Amino acid sequence: DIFYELSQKLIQDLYSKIPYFERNGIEYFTDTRRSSKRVSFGANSEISIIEATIDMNYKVIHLPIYNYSEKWKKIIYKYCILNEIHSCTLIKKDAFKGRCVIAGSLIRKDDFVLEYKGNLITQLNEAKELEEKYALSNRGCYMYYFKANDKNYCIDATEECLEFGPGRLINHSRKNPNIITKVLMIENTPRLFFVSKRDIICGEELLFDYGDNNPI
C-alpha cells in the first residue's frame, strides 16, 4: 500500500540524518538551498533560539526543550509544525503486533514527535456520516475527534495518503503511553500533534492513550 512507500520515505529520512547522529554520538536504528517560512516564527528576536534549538540542515531538534518555558516551547512547536520538522520514526510490520511506529533515534522528553495529519472536518454531521460509510464498507477508520478553542473538530486520516505520515498508525495503550497530544491554532486552523512524555529510546514503540476524553 502506502505502507511500503511510507516506510521507504521514513528510511530515507533516517539516512539523511545519519551524518548528524554520528557527529553527535547519538544512537540510531539499524536493520545547497534552504529557508524558513516567515509565518513559522513571530518577532525577529525569536530567531536566535530557534536556530540554536533546531539544526536547519538536518531538520532535527538539536537541543533539549523540556527546560524551556511554555512560551518558548510553543515557539518551537509552531516552527516544527510549519517547516515540517519531526522526530525520526520508522514503521515495522510483524506477524505478532501488526504495523507499529518506533523511534528511529532518541526522542527526548517534550520533543515534537509528529503532527497528526489528515483532512480536518469542522462540521460534525459530516464526520459521523463518514464514520458510517467506513464501517459499512468494512474499511478501518483513523479518525480523531477533539475539542480545541471551544470548538469540536475531527481529523480524518483514513485515506492512505503518503502526505499524512505515520502519526495515524500509532498503536494504543492506556497503561504505557509515551506520547500525548497538543494543539496549536495556526492561521485559524487547529494543528494536532504528538509530544513525548519522556525520553523514548531508539527502537522503542510509540504508544498513545486514545481514550483521554478531556479538552486539549
TrEMBL record:
Residues 73-211 form the SET domain. This is Protein with a SET domain within carboxy region. It comes from Cryptosporidium parvum (strain Iowa II). The lineage of its organism: Eukaryota, Sar, Alveolata, Apicomplexa, Conoidasida. The chain holds residues 292 to 545 of 556 of the full protein.
